Design a protein around this ligand. Structure first.
Ligand SMILES: *[C@@H]1O[C@H](CO)[C@@H](O[C@@H]2O[C@H](CO)[C@@H](O[C@@H]3O[C@H](CO[C@H]4O[C@H](CO[C@H]5O[C@H](CO)[C@@H](O)[C@H](O)[C@@H]5O)[C@@H](O)[C@H](O[C@H]5O[C@H](CO)[C@@H](O)[C@H](O)[C@@H]5O[C@H]5O[C@H](CO)[C@@H](O)[C@H](O)[C@@H]5O)[C@@H]4O)[C@@H](O)[C@H](O[C@H]4O[C@H](CO)[C@@H](O)[C@H](O)[C@@H]4O[C@H]4O[C@H](CO)[C@@H](O)[C@H](O)[C@@H]4O)[C@@H]3O)[C@H](O)[C@H]2NC(C)=O)[C@H](O)[C@H]1NC(C)=O
Ligand SMILES: CCCCCn1c(C)cc(=O)n2cc(-c3ccc(Cl)cc3)nc12
Ligand SMILES: [Ca+2]
Ligand SMILES: [Ca+2]
Ligand SMILES: [Ca+2]
Ligand SMILES: [Cl-]
Ligand SMILES: [Cl-]
Ligand SMILES: [Cl-]
Ligand code: NA
Ligand SMILES: [Zn+2]
Length: 808
């Protein structure tokens, strides 16, 4: 109930919303059916439109008008945005040359530069180039301020998850808005785009920017606008709020446009009908900037122009139907479209079986346009699993396609030529970022970055301390002229031991054997030096990683590699080695095929054993430093140390062996040397975070050897590839991956072919940021470089995506 007979007189677009049943006058009252009877009349005036004309100049104030051209309008804060252009001989903001804003130029009484977030739904990154002729205001913001060629959204690349990620710096799995449509089994409630349930606060986790600001004493405009409030009125409302007295005036504001997404759905991303929506958004930007210039604020406010996701060509005839795969289609509920989420239709049905559902969906048709996953098997870079609202079964849908349950769902629920929601690495899903103002850099291009990073910078712009989030604070310092955040490196928690020779060979009873009993003063001075770390500067290029949790581990040096060996997990946490462009690949000699060697530095009790691998009929083993890349026949024996061994399913060894034998050498060839750091990851509860020992769900049969869920590698070299990886004077270049450690290769439909047709493709799908690996291992990399820490934070957030050129 709302007692809608109160009045909006002097309350139009009030900043604190009043409680029911009193009637509201704020920018969301419409969406709630709760505006006072006179809201339209008083607050949504339209008379005479949005522009001053010659004949209205100096007019007598008529309060009925949408906006004003009377002499008092500047004092009242309610002129039309073009008032000074028409009536006072001023130029439009877009017609002025740009001039560096070295310092904020603000009216007296402004305590900080205000921030205006101008968000545009469905604004695909390539619109900046492709629509440049029709967006002169946007193009000026872009070329005069700071811009990225594109900004990466979060998965799924839908509206609500991305706008709330923008607001919180959180992955959807953490903020809770995991799609545009959701079922929460604990609430037993459903969230939808249409309806009242989405207004309930229990869906919305984390701490959005307006709440962060309010708690710290920074006033915020209300971010959200009812659909029927026209854009011109949203702008006038922001401009009026900016004329409030100092103690009442917000410091942060948001404008939101439903375009170009709304048209892109109907006409496709580049439909000829798309030019007009782009022209119109640009005109709205022009209105804002002209209005700021009127208020003397155009060299005072920081403006962020930011999209939520792009838009792909998608039509009705490109739909896959689950009814073509499953017999039991009525026992499932599907969340359909550009991603698929599957759960049982009834929880009283104990015949429903996910394992058979996935098997029925796996590599069934030669051209299949979706791939099924258990959510914990999705590429870790998507961070899409740790939420009870995310169903166990997920379908990753190919770009340009839909999935639906039955054909009737499509013609009785073509109507659309665009959609989005696909894997956030897809070129068509990328979106835009521009920052313009005193706090942003002048005419500066910055590399692509992820939208999870923005909340931190928005907090920096407003002098706020961010709530805990998934950005890496400092990684976007290069966007800013001032207000940079100066982070310190995390403190190392555990210091390593450096064991020397402490055990005789006969003390080990591991059931291992090696044919290594054939063998100076020359190269035994040498072998001792190597075990003392004489070659460590070659293989450990950026310092040892820091261990940021409490544990017990040893540093082990060798001719060709260095490792941090965990006495708790019985294997390295990391293994570091450098492969120069000149290095050669050799084979494993026949007599060394099954060779495993006790490590006389490490006790039997802290060592793996070969008998466990013999008894475990599912599990085999691999090595972290590859024997194929040994520098000499004698160095090769080090690669067979029991301390370099890790458990591997035979199906996974196909992947790993090909990476080690073929791909590392290929990368060293292409990149002029690479430094490699590899190791295991344990994430049995799929939360993106390093497991403690008591979370491990699987061991090598009969032993305490824990089985990794994933294996990572971080592959670094010189950004200037004219320099070798081990002699690099400047910025670095990195690519990384987190490969799932699976007992089958069902994920790769071509896996019965040669590894040369499918392995590298798998690896690319599981591309990762160094930061993702840090969360998963509790390690901190790049501790000792000659680079600034902010530059290193940027490198750690980099994602190598393997898409071709944006725009093309
Ligand atoms: C991305 O970034 C985010 C943010 O940094 C990372 O996510 C954080 O990660 C932490 C570790 O997993 C986790 O810590 C938890 O916190 C538990 C309490 O959590 C509640 O309170 C949070 C605080 O809100 C307040 O914030 C400020 C202060 O900062 C205050 O001023 C305000 O007043 C706020 O109220 C709150 O954020 C959190 O929200 C979640 O839950 C809500 C509904 O469930 C949702 O609305 C919301 O969306 C959040 O949902 C996510 O997170 C939960 C887990 O919290 C997850 O289940 C969901 O799927 C979803 O992903 C809460 O309301 C605290 O109890 C935990 O401590 C337990 O665990 C350890 C384990 O040993 C012990 O230390 C401890 O003893 C305790 O165990 C006991 O309890 C268990 C019962 O469950 C039991 O098993 C055990 O036996 C014991 O009895 C732990 O510290 C953060 O909550 C989490 N934050 C967020 C926002 O998600 C994320 O990791 C990053 N991702 C990556 C890859 O890096
Ligand atoms: C935020 C959760 C999703 C709500 C989407 N939504 C709608 C529909 C209207 C509207 O006016 N806005 C404005 C914003 C928004 C979100 C984040 C930032 Cl930083 C700034 C503005 N979102 C909406
Ligand atoms: Ca959207
Ligand atoms: Ca075995
Ligand atoms: Ca974990
Ligand atoms: Cl969804
Ligand atoms: Cl296989
Ligand atoms: Cl593109
Ligand atoms: Na949307
Ligand atoms: Zn859309």
């Amino acid at each position: 109930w709302t007692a809608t007979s109160g009045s909006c007189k002097g309350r139009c677009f009030e900043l604190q919303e009043v409680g029911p049943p009193d009637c509201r006058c704020d920018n969301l009252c419409k969406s709630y059916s709760s505006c006072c009877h006179d809201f339209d009349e008083l607050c949504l005036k339209t008379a005479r439109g949005w522009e001053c004309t010659k004949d209205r100049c100096g007019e007598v104030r008529n309060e009925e008008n949408a906006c004003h051209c009377s002499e008092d309008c500047l004092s009242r804060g309610d002129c039309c945005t073009n008032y000074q252009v028409v009536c006072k001989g001023e130029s439009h903001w877009v017609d002025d040359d740009c001039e560096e804003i070295k310092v904020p130029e603000c009216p007296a009484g402004f305590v900080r530069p205000p921030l205006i977030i101008f968000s545009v739904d469905g604004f695909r990154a390539s619109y900046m180039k492709k629509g440049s002729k029709v967006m002169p205001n946007i193009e000026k913001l872009r070329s005069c301020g700071t811009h990225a060629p594109y900004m990466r959204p979060v998965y799924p690349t839908k509206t609500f998850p991305n706008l709330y990620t923008l607001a919180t710096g959180l992955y959807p799995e953490s903020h809770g808005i995991v799609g545009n449509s959701m079922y929460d089994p604990v609430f037993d409630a459903s969230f939808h785009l249409r309806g009242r349930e989405k207004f309930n606060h229990r869906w919305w986790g984390g701490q959005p920017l307006w709440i962060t600001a309010t708690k710290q004493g920074v006033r915020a405009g209300t971010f959200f606008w009812s659909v029927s409030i026209p854009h011109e009125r949203r702008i006038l409302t922001i401009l009026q709020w900016l004329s409030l007295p100092d103690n009442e005036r917000p410091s942060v504001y948001a404008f939101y446009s439903e375009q170009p997404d709304f048209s892109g759905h109907k006409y496709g991303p580049f439909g000829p009908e798309m030019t007009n929506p782009l022209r119109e958004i640009d005109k709205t930007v022009g209105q804002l900037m002209d209005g700021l210039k009127q208020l003397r604020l155009h060299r005072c406010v920081n403006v962020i122009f930011v999209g939520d996701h792009g838009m792909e060509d998608v039509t009705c005839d490109r739909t896959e139907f689950l009814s073509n795969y499953l017999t039991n289609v009525d026992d499932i509920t599907l969340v359909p479209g550009t991603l698929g989420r599957i759960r049982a239709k009834s929880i009283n049905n104990s015949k429903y079986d996910p394992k058979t559902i996935i098997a029925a969906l796996t590599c069934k048709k030669p051209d299949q346009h979706f791939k099924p996953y258990m959510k914990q098997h999705l590429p870790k870079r998507l961070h899409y699993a740790n939420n009870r609202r995310i169903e166990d079964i997920h379908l990753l849908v190919d770009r340009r396609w839909h999935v639906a349950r039955k054909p009737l769902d499509v013609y009785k629920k073509c109507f659309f030529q665009g959609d989005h929601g696909f894997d956030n690495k897809v070129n068509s899903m990328q979106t835009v970022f521009v920052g313009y103002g005193p706090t942003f850099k002048y005419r500066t291009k910055v590399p692509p970055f992820e939208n999870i990073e923005l909340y931190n910078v928005m907090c920096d712009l407003l002098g706020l301390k961010p709530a805990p989030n998934n950005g890496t604070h400092g990684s976007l310092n290069h966007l800013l002229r001032t207000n940079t955040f100066r982070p310190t490196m995390p403190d190392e928690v555990s210091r390593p031991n450096y064991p020397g020779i402490m055990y005789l060979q006969s003390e080990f009873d591991l059931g291992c054997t090696c044919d290594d009993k054939v063998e100076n003063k020359l190269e035994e001075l040498n072998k001792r030096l190597h075990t003392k770390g004489s070659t460590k500067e070659r293989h450990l290029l950026y310092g040892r990683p820091a261990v940021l949790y409490r544990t017990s581990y040893d540093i082990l040096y060798h001719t060709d590699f260095e490792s941090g060996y965990s006495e708790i997990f019985l294997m390295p946490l990391w293994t570091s080695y450098t492969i120069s462009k000149q290095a050669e690949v050799s084979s494993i000699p026949e007599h060394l095929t099954n060779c495993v060697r006790p490590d006389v530095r490490v006790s039997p009790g802290f060592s793996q054993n070969c008998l466990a691998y013999k008894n475990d009929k599912q599990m085999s083993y691999g090595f972290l430093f590859p024997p194929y890349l040994s520098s000499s026949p004698e160095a090769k024996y080090d690669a067979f140390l029991v301390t370099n061994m890790v458990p591997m399913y035979p199906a996974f060894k196909r992947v790993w062996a090909y990476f080690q034998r073929v791909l590392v050498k290929k990368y060293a060839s292409e990149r002029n040397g690479v430094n490699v750091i590899s190791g295991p990851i344990f994430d049995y509860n799929y939360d993106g975070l390093r497991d403690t020992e008591d979370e491990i769900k699987q061991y090598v049969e009969g032993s305490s050897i824990p089985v990794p869920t994933h294996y990572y590698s971080i592959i670094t070299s010189c950004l200037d590839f004219t320099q070798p990886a081990d002699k690099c004077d400047g910025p670095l270049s990195v690519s990384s991956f987190i490969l799932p450690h699976r007992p089958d290769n069902d994920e790769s439909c071509n896996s019965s072919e040669d590894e040369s047709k499918w392995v590298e493709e798998l690896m690319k799908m599981h591309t990762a940021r160094v930061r993702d690996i840090e969360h998963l291992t509790g390690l901190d990399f790049y501790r000792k470089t000659s680079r600034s820490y902010s530059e290193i934070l940027t490198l750690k957030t980099y994602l190598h995506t393997y898409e071709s050129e944006i725009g093309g």
